[PDB]
Amino acid sequence: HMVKKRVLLWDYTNTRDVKWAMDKINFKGPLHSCSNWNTWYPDELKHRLPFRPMIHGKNNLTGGEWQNILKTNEEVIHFFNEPERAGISPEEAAKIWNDQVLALRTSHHKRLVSPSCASDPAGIAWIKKWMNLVAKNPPDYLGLHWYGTKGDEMIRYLESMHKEHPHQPIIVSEWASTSRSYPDVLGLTVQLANWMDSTPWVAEYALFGCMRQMADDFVSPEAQLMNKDGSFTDLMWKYMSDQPMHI
């Protein structure tokens, strides 16, 4: 039986410059869903994967951005992206969650992923307090990011967050090796892909790096899933073609 819980992170820069790249995807592999950090739909997907709209920040709560969220036929919707690094307090996000985001479950019967905070103390403390404030109306999924070089350390973090918040499944909305050594990137990617596949309470995980330009200095050139011409790397090929993954 083919395990399929691998999210295709499709950065909006792909939609802008290299639409045609989406047709070079392998859809007969472990690829399961798609997301693009936005409310709007990447048309080049042509509904070949379930799409998860995201309410990225306070700028996607009004106008056309909110209409995109209200009118979607897609089943699962993400809340804020790393709100702790954008001046959104747990008090704030909780009061938005109750007043407008809740309606998407109670009325439109959508499943809601929590805000995906970073795996640093500030992020862990932010989700801890938010989940507590909205405990009477909890999210359907716990959203996590993880970045580092030690695969054994990502596992303990997921095991640690599953222990702290045991009442729903986990989605890893972003993750990658930050290692500048490719064998250590390939090594980590392959380890956790195979590990998360056979962990029942991990619903889906989303490998970062599918975009032409480097997102920032923090992430690794060796962990890129798309070359500068829009073609796919070997890491991307294996990510979307191989289950189990292999080095």
Ligand SMILES: OC[C@H]1O[C@@H](O[C@@H]2[C@@H](O)[C@H](O)O[C@H](CO)[C@H]2O)[C@H](O)[C@@H](O)[C@@H]1O
């Ligand atoms: O096996 C999982 C771990 O893989 C590590 O990379 C390996 C290198 O340390 C080793 O020297 O070479 C092999 C390939 O021959 C690599 O797979 C990662 O550094 C770890 O993050 C990971 O847990």
